[PDB]
Amino acid sequence: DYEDAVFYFVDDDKICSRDSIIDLIDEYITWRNHVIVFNKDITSCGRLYKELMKFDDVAIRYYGIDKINEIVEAMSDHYINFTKVHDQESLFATIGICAKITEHWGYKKISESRFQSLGNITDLMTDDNINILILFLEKKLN
């Protein structure tokens, strides 16, 4: 039952295990849909989720709002090839874009019909990208 999905990192203020990074991004991208679909309080989350939410701004800086709106329309075509994302700004923009897409779906009353549709998280979260992300988050959250 999607209503009863569990979010293990939602109240965390820290992350300090690289082996949790994929789980965290997977959950967080689901949460940006779920929080709209079930009208949960978007403010009831910890510093870790708040840091990830700032990647919305990174995506806007990187793409601009028109291209964002375009990419979201396309996905809802995989505009972004996760296997081609190899630097910090591109990585954070891509996480931001994924959050915008699943949030947008929630605004449109779309959820389960688009599960397993974004592409392979393991293509995005190479070991280097995992390291980029966790070092960044530790520096912000230390």
Add this chain to the structure above:
Amino acid sequence: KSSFFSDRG
């Protein structure tokens, strides 16, 4: 767990 990613859930 469910997921929006194709290689998860």
